[PDB]
Each structure stands twice: as structure tokens, then as C-alpha cells.
RNA sequence: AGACAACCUGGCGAACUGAAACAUCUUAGUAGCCAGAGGAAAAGAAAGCAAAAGCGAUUCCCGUAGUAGCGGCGAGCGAA
RNA sequence: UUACUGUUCCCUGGGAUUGGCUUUGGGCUUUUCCUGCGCAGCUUAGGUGGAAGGCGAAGAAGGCCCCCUUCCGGGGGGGCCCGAGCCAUCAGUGAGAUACCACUCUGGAAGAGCUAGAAUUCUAACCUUGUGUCAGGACCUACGGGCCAAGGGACAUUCU
């Protein structure tokens, strides 16, 4: 029997001083997501570099053990001989412009769609379904390229592009506060171990000042990158 | 050790020092005498210490404890 | 490290527990002023001057929050304010017939400075939300019978 | 208080002379001045030394080296 | 003695007793703004994960005028007259990367502050002399101690 807000509470279950580790900040980050629906878990890292320059900038990708990989049902859609290299690569389902009438019926047993540049003319019409669902392939995501083989096989690992802004802090949602416990560990760990190997040779001294793992709207927490 | 002489109150007397720059010689050094004012707690007494007993004359129960009867107001 | 307590043109009130100026108490603030000396000996003593000022949140609040509990299942308040004029009334109600009614049955008395703005003159159910302190609130009902 | 014979603790503190010159240094932290106490004082059972072997209070005597070390590494002094 | 090596005295500066405000002027921790539009994309995206529901007590169109970045071809923000209500994002288009919703730096300024220096004021010492009151019976020209008050004012002096 007691009335509370939405800050004082969470602010009590966390500490700024103590340096919570990966395993510790695990059963804590989930307790800080007492919000509607599924909240996303991010991770802010303070890099000691110079944003004004480019040689100091960091740009790469991290392979998240969970969220992506084989669990995903990527569907390949191309023509010509690009259809053969799709099945031999290891895709869930492959087909030409014939399956276009299938998705219109209600078949959406997929999460990742990729196609060439010689079919986008018709795929563009699906901007009403695949468009909003972000299922439509885009050049940026690299989902649109003649080398569909290296594409479908690439998503089989799953990556998350990341860079440095005018400040010098990097952050990429390694998942949500709904996933398991052991999962949120390998993802966060892989995120660091990956970005670390992308440090500029021009960097001098400590490359990391402090690491944090916050969510959509809630207090932060200093995470130990070493562990 | 013992602070030089310029009065009393607590310390003793002179304790000359020396040099070592380019030669050793007995230098007649002095002390950071100075004094302190204290009214509340007793009667006005200008104890001229040596900036090293200020924490043992007005801090502890050296006199801070305003006592009525007893030996002369002065430390003696 | 001292205890200001008596805030006087100084950055700090009720004694400062954080780094403060120096050489400003060795012969002024301390003597014939505000007994500071924030030492482990006066620290525990200082608390006994504030902790007893916080207890009112776990004690005084208790002996004031039960107001909504003690008064909630009480019988219906039958107070006739002279209902006539065809439909209106004669008696006047501003705060008296809003708190004095508590004594109307089984003794008990309450202050009149605990009621909100009066209610329109009628004979229906009244909603006298008893408001003691800005921390706890209660609810009181009032009715009128044509005499 | 003995205007205290020496020994002892403490404060302060030279020069002549030696360095075949002399201001570093040495010669003396002696002599000398002053204060206090004992008949012994002082010191004393050890945040020591050594060492991974172990000893293990202080003080005194004989050695360990008057070697090592220190120094216009000159004079000279001098460990553990 | 304008020989050498030291020293007393006479002086200068820092650190201490000297601490508390204000004004002007730097810097640091950086708060809030302003140039990382070359080109294409008509609109300035400095960016990732959203990639699709959410937002309803921290700056969301024009005629007319100024400043702030470039009223200074067109934009954003503060306002007087004119002046619809739920919004934005998006496929296509399309650069290497595009601005809404949830979080984020420099060079150079203003503000909130920390700190190193000048210039003012008062006061809590300190220095000092000075009406007077006091340690009385000190019916003596005097050091010293104390109260009160005045003056200077925490800039000497003292110590290293």
C-alpha cells in the first residue's frame, strides 16, 4: 500500500557508484523495463578520440549471436540464374516474381527479404505491404545487389553497423529486455569485443572512458567491458 | 622537537639550525611566534604561542572548559 | 569542514556536510556565533537534531493518515438544514454543517478548517471531502431530511 | 641553599693547530659556559637484524676489518 | 680596496597568521546557441538502432520588419495587423550516408561556477596609540594585565 512515480523507484534499484558487471547488470536491466510493450536495450560507450578528424572515426559491423543468424527466415526473390545460387546458398525459400502473388494473400512467414535490381520495378508496388514492414530491400541495407549469394549467406550471421558521431559515443541495441538472460550476455559481450578491434591506430592512451547500458527511457548503468 | 624562544605558554626555548647550501654553518634561526585572542570561556589572556600549540591551548580541554574556581586564570 | 546551521549570507543551510570555506571560523563564526566544528563527535549529535524532524513522516503521518480510515464506514449523516421554499432550503451551510455534524452523534470533534468550498443549497447527497493535510485526504457524506 | 671533586643526561658552542699555504674538510660538537638528577645515569625486551638458515632487550669487554664505505676520495675519519 | 669566500644590518617576492563580498579582465570544468549545402536530391541529414506505433505540463506554415548563421535568391528562432487543427515519417524518387517520435561533441561568445591576478568596502582578528572605566583605600612622573570606545585595517610586522 503505497503510491509511487516512475523514476524514484527504478532509481532505487540501481547505483551509479558500484561498477555492475555483465552478469550483474543482466538481472537488473530487465527490472528497469517496467514499461508497456517490449522495450529495447542499448549501450552507450565513451570513446577517447577526435571527431573532427576522420582517421579517428570508427566504422564496422558486429555479429550478434542472438536476434539474427539461422533463427531468421530470410526469403530470396530473384530471376535468371540468381535463383539457383540462392537455394544452393542455404535460403529458407526462393522464387521469382511468381511468389509476389503469394504475399498478397497473407503469406508473411518471413522477416528478411532480399532481391536484385532487375525486379525492384515490380517489388516497388509492394511498398504498401513490404514497404511499411521494412521488408522491402534497400541498397543501404545491402539487401539489393547482384551478389545475392554473398547476401543471403551474410545475413546467416547477422550484423549491426555502427559508427562515431560528432561527439564520440557509440550505441547499438543488442536486443530487448524480453530476451533470455544468457542471451543478453553474449550479445553485449560480442558488441564490445567486436567494436574494440575497430579502434583507430591514432588513438593514444585509454580508448574507453566508461561503458553504460541504458534502455528507451530509464537510468543508466556503468558496465565493465573487461568482463 | 622544541620550538625556539620568544616567550613560553607551552614550548621551551631556542633550538638553532644550520645550513647546507654550499657550506654548513650554525644559523641562529627563530620561531613563528605569533599570538591568539580568546575571551569567551574565561578572561582575556593574550597567549603568544608559536603557531604549533594553537591546537593544544584553545582546542582540547586546556582552558576551553570554562571553569569557575581553581588556580589563577593564567596557565602559569 | 564545519556546521553552518544558521544560514547567513553563506552557501549552505542547516549545516554543510560538504567542503566549505576555511579560516572563516577559526575566529568569528565559531566564537559568539554558530557552533560548527563538524567532527565525528558533533556529527551524531547533529543528526539527533534533524532525524527527529524527519520522524514526522513515519509517525505524525500515521497519526493523521488514519483519518480516512476511522471516518469512512460511519453511519449516514442525518442533518436537517430546513428544507422548504417549495424546493430550496432555509438553513445556511458553509462549514458548520460540514464538520460540526461529527459531534451530532457519539461525541467526537473536528476542525472546520479541513473542508473545501461549500456545496449548492439542495437536499441531495453531499460530497464533503475532508482534507486534513496535503499528504492525506478523507471522504464525508451529508444528507438532508425535510422536517 | 651547598656559591657542589669526578662520572652521567640535556641546551648552546671556538680557535690555535692539521690539510707542510689557506676560506671545504679536519682539528673540538673537546675545552669552556649553563641547567637537572642519580650514586649510577643514560639506554633498554625492539614497524631490529638477518634471512627464506635462524637469531632475537639494552649496556659493557675482546674480535670480526681499523676491511668496506665516506672525503678539494687530498688531509683525515672510520661501519656493520 | 671595483681580491676571494661568507655573514649582520638595510630591502623585494611566494608560502603561513589574512578571511568574507563586489567591479573589470583570462583560463578550466563546459550550459545554451552559431559555419563540417562541394555536387545530386527543388527543401542545409552532423548520425546508429526504430522502420512503425507513439506523442497531449522543456521553442510544430505564410503577407510585412530586424537581429542572430549568410533580411544580407528562398529557410529556423523572438513579436504587432492578416493567419485551418491532431502530426510526422514513407513507397516511388534517391546520395556513400537524408531531417519527425526515444538518446548524443569541438574552434569562438553570453550565462551559471572553480581558480590565478589588479582595483574598492566592511568586519571576526593583528598593530598601535589613545577619552575613560579598572587590579579599589597606588591622597607617586612609570612598564605590564583587563573592560569600553576611537583610529588604521585584515595591505605591516614576525617565521621559513
UniProtKB/Swiss-Prot annotation, chain A:
Gene Ontology process terms (BP): translation
Keywords associated with the record: Chloroplast, Plastid, Ribonucleoprotein, Ribosomal protein, RNA-binding, rRNA-binding, Transit peptide
Principal location: plastid
MF terms in GO: rRNA binding; structural constituent of ribosome
Cellular compartments per GO CC: chloroplast; large ribosomal subunit
Subcellular location: Plastid, Chloroplast
Keyword Ligase belongs to the record: no
UniProt family annotation: Belongs to the universal ribosomal protein uL1 family.
Job of this protein: Component of the chloroplast ribosome (chloro-ribosome), a dedicated translation machinery responsible for the synthesis of chloroplast genome-encoded proteins, including proteins of the transcription and translation machinery and components of the photosynthetic apparatus.
Subunit structure of this chain's protein: Component of the chloroplast large ribosomal subunit (LSU). Mature 70S chloroplast ribosomes of higher plants consist of a small (30S) and a large (50S) subunit. The 30S small subunit contains 1 molecule of ribosomal RNA (16S rRNA) and 24 different proteins. The 50S large subunit contains 3 rRNA molecules (23S, 5S and 4.5S rRNA) and 33 different proteins.
Protein's recorded name: Large ribosomal subunit protein uL1c
Source organism (scientific name): Spinacia oleracea (Spinach)
Lineage summary: Eukaryota, Viridiplantae, Streptophyta, Embryophyta, Tracheophyta
